[PDB]
Amino acid sequence: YTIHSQLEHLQSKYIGTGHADTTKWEWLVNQHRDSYCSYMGHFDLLNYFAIAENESKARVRFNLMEKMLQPCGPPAD
Amino acid sequence: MGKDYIYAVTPLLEDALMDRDLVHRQTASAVVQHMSLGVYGFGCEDSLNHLLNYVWPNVFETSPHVIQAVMGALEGLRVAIGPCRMLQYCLQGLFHPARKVRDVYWKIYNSIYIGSQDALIAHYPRIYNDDKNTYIRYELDYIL
Amino acid sequence: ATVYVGGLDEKVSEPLLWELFLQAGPVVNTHMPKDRVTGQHQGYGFVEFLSEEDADYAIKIMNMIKLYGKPIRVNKADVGANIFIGNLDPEIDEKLLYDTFSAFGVILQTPKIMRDPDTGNSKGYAFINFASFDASDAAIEAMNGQYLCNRPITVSYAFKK
Amino acid sequence: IPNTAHFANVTQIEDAVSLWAKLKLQKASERWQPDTEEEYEDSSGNVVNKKTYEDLKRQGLL
Amino acid sequence: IFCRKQAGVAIGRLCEKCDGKCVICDSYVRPCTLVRICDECNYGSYQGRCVICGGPGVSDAYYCKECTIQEKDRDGCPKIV
Amino acid sequence: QVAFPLQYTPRKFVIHPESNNLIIIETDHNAYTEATKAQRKQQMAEEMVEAAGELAAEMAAAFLNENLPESIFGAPKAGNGQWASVIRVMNPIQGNTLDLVQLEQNEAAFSVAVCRFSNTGEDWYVLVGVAKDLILNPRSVAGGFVYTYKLVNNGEKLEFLHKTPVEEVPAAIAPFQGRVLIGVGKLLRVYDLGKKKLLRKCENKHIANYISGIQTI
Amino acid sequence: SKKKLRRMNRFTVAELKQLVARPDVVEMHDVTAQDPKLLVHLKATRNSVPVPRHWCFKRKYLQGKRGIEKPPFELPDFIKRTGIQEMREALQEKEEQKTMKSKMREKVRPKMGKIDIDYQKLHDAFFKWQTKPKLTIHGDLYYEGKEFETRLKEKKPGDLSDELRISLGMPVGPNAHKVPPPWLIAMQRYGPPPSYPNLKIPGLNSPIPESCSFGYHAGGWGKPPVDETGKPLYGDVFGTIDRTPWGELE
């Protein structure tokens, strides 16, 4: 259970993990944020979207980082 | 240089993963761990799939050594077989009625997530959007 | 659905029994729930083909199939019950014979056709072990002189050799 | 209603019939029926289905 | 129990009892990469000690090639304090 | 390399075996077609005339007379759901655009195939998928249309034949055994030919989400 | 009690099966799960792999395998071939007979190099005759007694076995084609079974298997069942590209 002190330290360590009660909302929103961080990181899906819509890389990443805030609806209750 | 004897050895590990004892399955699991980390990248993934089929049932276990060697086998097998295959093994029991099974699957998925959280972005399922949330990812299905 | 595996062969395994059940139709149950002592086959079994006509035609087919080499019958679950049948049609087959002579009873021996051995073509006689002597009676009566394939039938109780 | 798995653990019969009702609807949906789908233009530049095409075809026009 | 307060550029060392094994994997083979520890488990009387025995720093703690394939060596000072 | 321009983003293209002749389908998001381009330009010149003060001050002529080449000056194209298209018939060996079909306002072409149905003969037809009124980050559509052109002048200009309405963005077309397979979203439907519309001889309905390719041996 | 109001949210299994788009999945305890719409969409996704059987059970994993007797492991062929097993059997019997005193005498004066087995026999087994065992593809978890479960869902008629042929009266081997089984006889006589009307019998509703024989004795095909006008019982009881791989080694 000191293992648990370390393990909810691990929950505090890695944003996106889970535990047996985790809610569909936390799960899917964390995966959605991660999806955004990687669309930004990988230099080429950025071209994919930039080219799919008719936007430009500054436009693209600005949208993405705005969306990063409430990507999957408002919260659960 | 295990890419040679992996075939010779599989039917003996499947033999000893169908029960013989706790220690029998603890040890066959350790063997799977090290085979997987050796054969990383040489294409012998069908054999490690076959042995996943036999190791994964031991997931519900209690003895510390046994469940621990099992978890080790699944990290090794994660690098060697890829994280799709193991996210698919871990899909259905994330949201299960029970709590023993919910907890083991969230333990695994945590370790699958920490290491290689960035592949999974192309491995997550398609999870439909109900009324007041948006859950589909339209980013990924722009055509071009 | 439920079929009596009669003359249920000892070593003729329930696995191939169910494989033949499938090779005929709906293999849903193949069971010969045996003696609580022996383990070997108990002479009558339940074969469920979940379609009634499926089991019916599968039974018509797997009768006279040589289970343990011996004809065993799929049906509804030696004091001289042998009948002599002459003016015999040489143009028949053995399962056709079992289905033509099995209408009034079981056939504990398929029709043994007393054919010449020089060639392999018969001279027109046979004998058939049916279930009952009243069975041989009724069948031999309905086919006394009656319409056989090419040479009209003539049947009655059989002689002993 | 057949003893297929889809109803197992549904024990009340009105539930069973409405369940198998929507199931029926879905099976008929995802069936491809050439009668209503497979469609035929007559010679006259206007279109009908397979059924009606053969209907008026073999009752003496097409 | 682990320190895990994040990594640095200070190498770790092994007593001679503990000579040879990896820090976690407990291997004896094919070590690839050197170990690094945190300043806090670097200072003072803890300079040059055995991450495992606590004995004197003489031989260099290393990382079994499996541990580097799975990058369990990118977490920092794993000192069992 | 040697580069022969276009004006809308190129999506896909197919080949003309008779004359080596290339049919490109190009189309863009976030753009007005030629028509609406000029029309809202002159219309904004009109509403511009109306300052009510010297009447005298005239800039509308200079508006309609300026044309600042978007090739350097960025493209005067905007909105959110605002699509634009073109089909172009060009020669690979030299860059002449021997024909240009320039489509409707929001009718976005996303798939192309040249085929000869065998009920008829060697009169080729070009088929084009053209979705209608799409949005991208929600998803939504109005509907698809199947543009057939008869590809005449031995294959050096298209004349329209018919545009069959259809359920979805028709994102893939494939010539297949004297007919055409068509992916329209979740459906995989097999089409044969008329000249009132296009008639469906087969359907399959089991594809998971959305059919972005068909390749057939 | 709040768990009890969520328990009144705890819908009916019919509630579920009618709601859901794919009803095969819905199981017993599905409903006591905090998010059954998810749980069911997941369990109905492609390619995913369901929880083991045995989380419900009170017995642990293979304590049910406890009872039986089991036969020792069976080596691979290409390792038997190299003849190791007989070497080891012989050495075994030797050292089980020998007595303690002689054991230590051999400890102090060894029988050095009693045996030999040549390399290139080994190296050719492991590097020249090693072969793919039978593997099971993604998903098919092993559960207790699975190897005992015989096999099912071969509704096909042509499926015959050699022991099946022998203990039914039919032939085994290359003659499993040209042998119409004793059930195709009454297939020709009164029809094939009316739940396998989508099955055609070979020599009875199908054509002659390779080099079959027409005739009415034991060993032939008899009268292919036909109408009085000549059309068979069904099908035809008588009988009336470029698959090259792209990357392949020379």
Ligand SMILES: [Zn+2]
């Ligand atoms: Zn280590």
Ligand SMILES: [Zn+2]
């Ligand atoms: Zn520290």
Ligand SMILES: [Zn+2]
């Ligand atoms: Zn030490």
